């Protein structure tokens, strides 16, 4: 079993510098060459650069070359990227990706991307408010989640064990702060004879927030 | 030598086939071994492979996809578009200067449907912070063209609002949306009734759901 695993979100200031790392399992690390794709919403994906993890050869895009280093230790099998000089269009999520051959020719397996936000505002926890209906066979719940920075914030309903019926809404920067929201539709048979709770996780700030939502009045 | 990719948008009926282009400004074929791949990505997932070297059909991939093409021209083919085949479809070079496409975005067309409207008051919690939020969800239409007025006591509001859309959904490939109507508190108090309108094409009279803080 081939596994990419890559590091979480990083919050950074204009002009410095990060790095994110790309550890790989499952085969011989040294052997293959490693790529780094940039993703920002309206650009599509983009090539930065690949390495040779046996001897740390590298090449790197024109358009990158200054502005990312590759680098590998091949004792650990983990590969790292670091960004200098950060602006706003630095702000995107990074993946690292292997490079087959034999079997295939190309880029099987991705890790799951390292987001990265360039900004100078300070970090803040998610509110998470219960939305319950005021005053039908199925009820419609939600979660209000609001007054974050950075992004991302991920979202589940009793803990994952319901799944169907839910709607989660993009994440909107509105003067340093996002919001978000989620609903989740259910039989009435089952609320609120049954628990529905959001969980709501926020890895930038190390927290997590649970909402049980209750009939009003 | 860049990819252009055609077209940015392709919008396809279930049942119907899809086919996007890809064009390298300079010859990169050595028919030998020709490094032209297509890659997928759904929203919130990874990039994944679809077709290496043009024809090549990786593992666990559907057998409606498929690779052709010579010269400077490749073919990405979709035989019998399915409603979990939505996404942003990517060509890529894995020769001399990697270089990806524009990439194309695959969207399902469809029957029209009205969306379910739930309104949902202040929560406790925030009021006693000092703020009031109302939110609105207008869940499973389509078309995705749809518009939201607020409504406090009658008059129409229209500072202060966040909306968001959701991307297709890949099981009944329709469209769902959330209006925020944020109020301080005080504001929110002086004012009893709120209304959430949607004007969807699959009506000329809009789908009405509010509310009143008195009950």
């Known amino acids: 079993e081939v596994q990419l695993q890559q590091s979480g979100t990083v919050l950074a200031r204009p002009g410095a510098s990060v790095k994110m790392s790309c550890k790989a399992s499952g085969y011989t690390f040294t052997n293959y060459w490693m790529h780094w794709i940039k993703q920002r919403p309206g650009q599509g994906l983009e090539w930065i650069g690949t390495?040779?993890?046996?001897?740390?050869?590298?090449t790197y895009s024109q358009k990158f070359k200054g502005k990312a280093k590759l680098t590998a230790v091949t004792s650990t099998s983990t590969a790292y990227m670091e960004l200098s000089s950060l602006t706003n269009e630095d702000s995107a999520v990074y993946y690292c990706?292997?490079?087959?051959?034999?079997?295939?020719?190309?880029?099987?397996?991705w890790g799951q991307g390292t987001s990265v936000t360039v900004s100078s505002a300070k970090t803040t926890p998610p509110s998470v408010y219960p939305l319950a209906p005021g005053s039908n066979s199925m009820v419609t719940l939600g979660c209000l989640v609001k007054g974050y920075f950075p992004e991302p914030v991920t979202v589940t309903w009793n803990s994952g064990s319901l799944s169907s019926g839910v709607h989660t809404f993009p994440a909107v920067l509105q003067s340093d702060l996002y919001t978000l929201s989620s609903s989740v539709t259910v039989p009435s048979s089952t609320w609120p004879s049954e628990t529905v709770t959001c969980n709501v996780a926020h890895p930038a700030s190390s927290t997590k927030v649970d909402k049980k939502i209750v009939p009003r009045d | 030598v860049l990819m252009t990719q055609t077209p940015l948008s392709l919008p396809v009926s279930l049942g119907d086939q899809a086919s996007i282009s890809c064009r390298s400004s300079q010859n990169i074929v050595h028919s030998g071994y020709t490094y032209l791949e297509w890659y997928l990505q759904k929203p919130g997932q990874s990039p994944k492979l679809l077709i290496y070297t043009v024809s090549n059909r990786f593992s666990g991939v559907p057998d409606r996809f498929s690779g052709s093409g010579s010269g400077t021209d490749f073919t990405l083919k979709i035989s019998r578009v399915e409603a979990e085949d939505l996404g942003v479809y990517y060509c890529?070079?894995?020769?001399?200067?990697?270089?990806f496409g524009g990439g194309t975005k695959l969207e399902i067309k469809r029957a029209d449907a009205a969306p379910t409207v739930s309104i949902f008051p202040p929560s406790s919690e925030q009021l006693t912070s000092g703020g009031a939020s109302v939110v609105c969800f207008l869940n499973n239409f389509y078309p995705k063209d749809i518009n939201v007025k607020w409504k406090i006591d009658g008059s129409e509001r229209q500072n202060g609002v966040l909306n968001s859309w959701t991307d297709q959904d890949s099981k009944d490939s329709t469209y769902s949306m959330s209006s925020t109507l944020t109020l301080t508190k005080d504001e929110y108090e002086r004012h009893n009734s709120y209304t959430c309108e949607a004007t969807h094409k699959t009506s000329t009279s809009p789908i009405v759901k509010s509310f009143n803080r008195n009950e």
């Open positions: 390495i040779y993890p046996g001897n740390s050869d590298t």
């Open positions: 990706s292997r490079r087959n051959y034999g079997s295939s020719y190309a880029m099987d397996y």
């Open positions: 890529f070079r894995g020769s001399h200067v990697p270089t």
